[PDB]
Design a protein around this ligand. Structure first.
Ligand SMILES: [Mn+2]
Ligand SMILES: [Mn+2]
Ligand SMILES: [Mn+2]
Ligand SMILES: [Mn+2]
Ligand SMILES: [Mn+2]
Ligand SMILES: [Mn+2]
Lengths: 314, 314, 314
């Protein structure tokens, strides 16, 4: 199968300068070369160039609406295109906000896709619920059909079309949920596994459920939109919103491994890596290194080891 | 329901100066204000003032017997009083030694209470078994009916009355148990879950058992007497007796969460926080911060998030 | 039962100077004295003195073949001898390479022994498969009957005799497996539990399987050859090959505990501790301390606590 790395150097989704530098940091780390060594064909589509909308006045609270709307629009166009060509897309972020268009394009080619959202936050705040204008906790709100019209249309997102509903998504590792955001997910009965559920059940049982829940009936394309703020800071320290008591480098690798083993991996988002927020070159190397680790995992690097077929090492 | 924060600036229970400063540190951290924001009414009864008994000569080995006996006596009086008024008590420690009177008063109003003891040590050394005169590993011995007369009466505790028996308590996170102390618990068949049991079972299954075991038949009031030396030092580093390989900030939060969900939370002890034993302002902030975290958990702060009822955030 | 501590100050098995100093560091830490306090008799046989073969030219790739071969030869002689005297051997390493002769001697007295290999690496690279000439990933290849003649004989190991086969060994904590090494283990159907299996199953279930698998039918002597690179660096940081996402100080202690509880503990290897690779005296103290911790565990120190029999602490 083919792999399409797509650059997403964006940051307007939030107030902390840095996330744009993400893809550059991941690539430098040897992301593209390492992948090749896998059983997949890899093509690096490069980084998209986002046109900065001048005088992007705030829509009430929401910040840089037009900038974000446009950037995403462009992305959904590219994702949609490669998905069309039947290649598995891999979106290197900026900030999560770009999850909007990375799923949009995908649903376009695969309308019956399910979504496994790895984050510590729901990011389902609507333009009426955000405490900050950061589109960085609103991605899911623009994607849900259930939340359609449940808030004013925003400058620049006129193009988005709620592609998935609450019966297709599954959060994993929630540990910082705002009131409004807890309300919504309880209201729309959205399937999740906050850190407590993980604790209780175990990464293993949790992955077993998310799977029978999102695939029990129909086997469909899976979209893994991973927030690096998903794991604990001790592994992914260079992020905008580090929340203590998160997913272990193991638990998380487990995840990307099982999902590899489903063979249904279609789209993948590596978001919120921020090479500048590193308190020491070490925390930035650490952060990056595991990010690359998850990715290679999603594409078959097993911890039990790997060997090329048909080769007699004896 | 009402909440009564009760100050317990005591330290004679052990040889390391510092634990008295605990409550001041926790409050500074915003313990009382944060609680209010919960669905409970909160009243800060302040810190008790412990009268120092002059010439408190050692009872054989046991140190500062009178000082401790008196301090506890006073506490059991206050706890007993608020419990009477039907409010859920929350004892901010010093050292664990004050667990004696914090449960005493409680049993007085609720004679059929069960106890979930979170610590890394049993603290069930009797005046004949302690290697050190520290009443800080003897709290349970003064509370157990089974251990009645199994040791000489001590100067100042004449007042205590073994309120609970071995069939009502459950340890969680034992990792440093002295010979005498392992003997006793094996002798009186005391239900526990040392780190190994947690490992084997899982925080989840463990909380499921402790619950069917202590509540299967009769639903009763629960007294959560939490030692901060319960979790691993990497989370609660500022303590008198740090033992490696302990309860994760998650596992522990899981606990305080399930117990919240039983609705049977009556008395709560936050003991052995010691702001002075911090190797760096960081370890003291860390220690404190989680202590406050457990507490707010016990009172409903879920990791899956929270929202006030009847409010349409839409 | 008797315990024989055997010194193995060796390092030629790899390119990083330091592992020889291991035993000195462990002993300094109070390894021998602490053991005595256990229910076993302890004798410290001292450290062996390894004769340095001059002009030990490389066998193709393999480095210092003769040096390693000879050192091991000597060890297998001593191990074989004490095992004969029916005492449980405990080999303090250098590098793992010495696992070769520490098992050799053992099989000599106990030909039907099983092996639980705790490491993060398989160390089953054959002289044809190693990327480096480091006999430090080849121990298992010289021990397996299945790999007999599957590579050229090496200068100095003429003496070794494949004592165990693939149906007697069980790896635990694999997280860095080379191609050739993954091939072999898949080819010879070698039972393992890479970090993922641990994640999935749980230390508990994993120890339950390894046991029904290696002892279900015949109860036999167990040889625990522990690599300190088995646990995560956060606990055992002073090692040649630290791999992220490993065995927790708990999971590992669990292990040495269950194996204690089988009563079948015969030989034990504490390898790759390297006091010099410590970035801070702390990481070296940490590393050592847990190493000693595992060992005392293997010999009965329970986390639930311990008490001498027949003694009334009351
Ligand atoms: Mn996000
Ligand atoms: Mn996030
Ligand atoms: Mn205590
Ligand atoms: Mn304690
Ligand atoms: Mn090894
Ligand atoms: Mn190794």
């Amino acid at each position: 199968k083919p792999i399409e790395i797509i650059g997403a150097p964006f940051s307007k989704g939030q107030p902390r300068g840095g996330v744009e530098k993400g893809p550059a940091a991941l690539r430098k780390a040897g992301l593209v070369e390492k992948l090749k060594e896998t059983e997949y064909n890899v093509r690096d589509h490069g980084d998209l160039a986002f046109v900065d909308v001048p005088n992007d006045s705030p829509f009430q609270i929401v910040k840089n609406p037009r900038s974000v709307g446009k950037a995403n629009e462009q992305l959904a166009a590219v994702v949609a295109e490669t998905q069309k060509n039947g290649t598995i897309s891999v979106v290197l972020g900026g900030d999560h906000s770009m999850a909007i268009g990375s799923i949009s394009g995908h649903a376009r080619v695969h309308p019956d896709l399910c979504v496994i959202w790895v984050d510590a936050h729901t990011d389902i705040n609507t333009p009426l619920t955000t405490s900050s204008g950061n589109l960085n906790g609103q991605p899911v709100a623009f994607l849900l059909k259930e939340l359609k019209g449940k808030f004013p249309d925003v400058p620049g997102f006129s193009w988005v079309t709620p592609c998935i509903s609450a019966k297709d998504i599954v959060y994993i590792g929630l540990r910082d949920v705002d009131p409004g955001e807890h309300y919504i997910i309880k209201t729309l009965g959205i399937k999740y596994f906050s850190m407590t559920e993980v604790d209780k059940l175990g990464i293993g049982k949790v992955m077993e459920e998310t799977f029978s829940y999102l695939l029990g009936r129909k086997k469909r394309p899976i979209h893994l939109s991973f927030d690096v703020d998903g794991l604990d800071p001790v592994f992914t320290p260079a992020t905008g919103t580090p929340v203590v008591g998160g997913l272990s480098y193991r638990e998380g690798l487990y995840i990307t491994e099982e999902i590899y083993k489903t063979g249904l991996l279609s789209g993948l988002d590596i978001m919120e890596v921020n090479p500048t927020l590193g308190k020491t070159p070490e925390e930035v190397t650490r952060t990056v290194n595991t990010a690359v680790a998850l990715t290679l995992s999603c594409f078959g690097t097993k911890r039990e080891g790997n060997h090329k077929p048909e080769t007699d090492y004896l």
